[PDB]
Amino acid sequence: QIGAVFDDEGITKCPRVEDGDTSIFGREIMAELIKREKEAWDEEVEEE
Amino acid sequence: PGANPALAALAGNDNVSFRPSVKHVISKELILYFDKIQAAILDDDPDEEKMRLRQAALESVRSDPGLHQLLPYFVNFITNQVTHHLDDLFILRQMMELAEAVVQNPTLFIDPYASALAAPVLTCLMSRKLGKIDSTLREQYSLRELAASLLSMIARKYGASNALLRPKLTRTCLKHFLDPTRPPAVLFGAISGVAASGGPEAVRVLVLPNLKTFDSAVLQPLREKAGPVAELEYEMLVGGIVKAVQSIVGNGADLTREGEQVIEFLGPIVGQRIAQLRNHTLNRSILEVRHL
Amino acid sequence: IDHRRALFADLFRRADERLNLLFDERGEYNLSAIESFKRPTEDARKELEQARIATEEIAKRSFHTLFYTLEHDRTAMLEQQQLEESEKQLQAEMDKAGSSSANLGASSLTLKHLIARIDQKRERVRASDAELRSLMNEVRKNRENIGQEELYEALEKVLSELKAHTEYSTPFLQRVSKREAPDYYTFIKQPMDLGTMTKKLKSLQYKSKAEFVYD
């Protein structure tokens, strides 16, 4: 019952370089994270 | 930035963690008023001026139009005073007066506090040990009857918003009454409470059937006690039962016949008193449950 | 007075049966009733279990039926304070010697992150929350010798049951201090009471049932 939640294969593996573009820092996602981080910085400055 | 942090706590939200203190929610003037009222109320000096400061404090708490924020504190104060000072008649009397003054304020919503108010009143009414020679008995019985009247008013007022208040009060009083092991004072208080809470129908349908057994069970053993204190307690029990029976309503020898039938039904003492009352409608009301 | 007691109990039972129908939903008389009246190592555990369920069942049911006087709250407050004081007094001595919405309890901290993840993916899991708490409770840890473990668990449980009788266990809770009874060790060469048994709990001085029966 409980174990079904953790079924995703990535919970225990370490991605390998040989596989290819397995980096967890893909630009497609880093673009949004940077924008959100910039947003938080501006909010802090306004508060500060 | 200008919003008070205590508004979230006032809203009752679960996610809130900060717990405001008393100093954050109540204004300073209200705190001073509460302290002054409590100090004036609990003065035991028999000097007329202190009594009158007490009366003025009671009137103020009764008629002030801005005490909406002190209801929980008043209720808790009454409960604490009744709880921790069961060996002081004066404090119990003052607490009863304060409770009477609180429920008579027309600018307060007392619906959800009815049971909390009723519990200390019940404790004062039906507790074996009150205070700690004839003056002591006078004070104790006066306190018991005053508590009975206050309970009657509370049950009549807040019995609809509280669904199970009346049945529970009646059940407690009746259960405490149907126990010979209790001393006369407890039985007196219990019968008064049954009459005050259940109503005329509850009396007629729950006490009258068993008065015949109760007489020979309790009254006669006490009747043989010649002690003046025992005589007074016997008289008080009989008077309370007679008043409870008379609460139902408040020609030749037909009245004598009805009185003799009542004596057969109710018992020697209570029956003789009811017959001596020389009332026909009352006797009809009592005898209407003879088959039961 | 036993016959009188039984007679009055039966009388009260009859009167209560009669009263049960006297009040309607709005706290008002039901005229129909008025007119009707006007008419002319497991079996013992199971035995302990069923007993406790029956007692508590009526105990909770009494909440909706009766009121109770406030003439015993002061003693309860004082009694608990004395027990709390005794507990702390016994503390500072042995310690130095030994040197999601549902109210799951303190264990939830050990699975707070897991409890957060399970709900988000509540579609994969198929148990019920009540069962899952039961599953979590069952699997949650209880804390050379065979029978030592459960015997000690039983021994401490019976000790706690003895503590449950707080109405009577107060006088003997703590050992007889020399200050209280300086002649105790001169008269009684074997000081042994509830305090003594508690002191022995973390020192492994229990072998068989008959040992404690002698105690």
Place this chain on the structure above:
Amino acid sequence: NLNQIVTDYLKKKGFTRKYLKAFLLLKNWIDNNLDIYKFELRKLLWPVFVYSYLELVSQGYVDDAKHLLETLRSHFEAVHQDQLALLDENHTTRLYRENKYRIPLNQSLSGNLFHFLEREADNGGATIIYILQTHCSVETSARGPIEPYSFEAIYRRARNLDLDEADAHGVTNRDVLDTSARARDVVMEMQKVRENRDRFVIEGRTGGIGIPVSACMFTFHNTLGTVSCMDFSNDHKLVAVGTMDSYIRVWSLDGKPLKSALENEKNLKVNNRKLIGHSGPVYGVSFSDSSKLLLSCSADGQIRLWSLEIWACLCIYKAHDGPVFRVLWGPHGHYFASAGWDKTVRVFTQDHASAVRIMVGHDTSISALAWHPNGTYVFSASDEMDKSIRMWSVITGNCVRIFTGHTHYITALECAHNGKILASADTGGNIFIWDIEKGTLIKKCRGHGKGGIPSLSFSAESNVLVSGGLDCTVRVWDIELPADPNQITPDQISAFATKKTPVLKVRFTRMNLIVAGGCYDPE
């Protein structure tokens, strides 16, 4: 600059630089106490009545004395038949005048009675105080309350004691305490009570938060969006709603059957009725100052007066030219006002078929109304280009104040009970608080959503305001924030949300409780 224009205009204009009421009040107070006190309290009824009757007879108002005698005769007809027949001069009156009545009472009861009488000095307690001082004398005692089965009576009967001076002096306690079964210093006591009472007043407010209030909600189902107006009676016993189908419906708020004075409808069993007769959508309804009368207006240009005793119309008022949008009774219920499409405000009295006053000055249709608590001023508001509020005098019919500042359609108007503050709301979610005497805005409240705020209400002491909006919320505001101890404005005490029910009405009761109403729409 407006100041320059006003100064120039002003300079160019040569501007240089009786006893029955008291008895009824006492009786009503008496039956309110505990049943223990009532036995001793009833002893005050007869002396007060007889002395009042004799005073009225002596003063020459024989008509008033006769009215009092006939009115109260039923109350005492079962005790004092002979005395009442005599009252229909003999030595009895002389004896009554010479000897002042003696009434025993307890000290605590005396204190409570004196406090109660002082609390209502100007309402009618002064008459009783004077009567008791002059024609009566109270022998206060420290004994317990006297009852047929109280401690004092039981003790006296059992121990075979003797009567006292108070008990010595046609009902007499001797018949009860006998085997056959002090004075007072009023006036001084009054000033003395006043001095003691004046010490327990609250004269400040620092720190703390706002007041907590409860709320009860009434929801209407299966309306299908045809309800236009709502109103509760002054005592919260009836609810009336007007519809777009031209009829009105009244309900009992507790489900009890409604009653009709018509004999043919004797003891009929229905808890809701209908008032029919309008030929257009009904936009306003108003309960009169129990309520026996009702007013309504519709898009057909008529105002109808209904009777809540026979449930039928009585009169029609035909003064308007076009739709009528709002109608309101006066603060005491003889005058009423109306305003609609033709940009005019009219004041009526129920005795006349034509408007007694006509109020010109608005440039667009009227969308709100309100009365002043003293019953001599009216407030109105217009929409569109001319978004202003005006205050009219009923004596002259002229405008005396104008309030400007609103930028949206004005939906509700309300005047405080003290008579010095005015509140108004618009469809932008704003609530304005105005100073009437200075004609200046005090502050603005924010937090409501867009759509409209149909209703407003003021607390009993005028320190708290409650509003209901079409965004399904009920909000509470603090008029004056507490003094500091050193999207939403910080004076909003609370805010509640309904389950898809726009609120059309809020009302403050005597306590810190309100009642709301609305229509439930699943979509």
Place this chain on the structure above:
Amino acid sequence: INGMALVGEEAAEQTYEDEAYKIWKQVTKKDRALIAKERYQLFANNKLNVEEPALLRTKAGMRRFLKSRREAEALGLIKTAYSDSSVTSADRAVPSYYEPQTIIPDIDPKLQWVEDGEGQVINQFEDMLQLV
């Protein structure tokens, strides 16, 4: 020693008693002691201490009260509309009167909002209904 004397007095007074009463005391003692201690702390020296936690209403207490009310309803003692099926379109061991800040007043059963399976509001006034 007075405490021991009082304990002995209660022990002697226990000759007249009832077992269910003892069970009730055993069940409710801990919560009663906690509440009594809090109340005593609040009004120390008969003065309103300005540091103790304020008395406020919370949603969890009212949820506990609702659970108790549903338990009472299961006994067939009252009728309530608090069940989730009505509209479709610590665990203190003390009686409710010990916590005044968790009680909700009652509505008349005939005026309660109860829905059928379809989603319509049932009318409770069957006496005054008529057939077309």
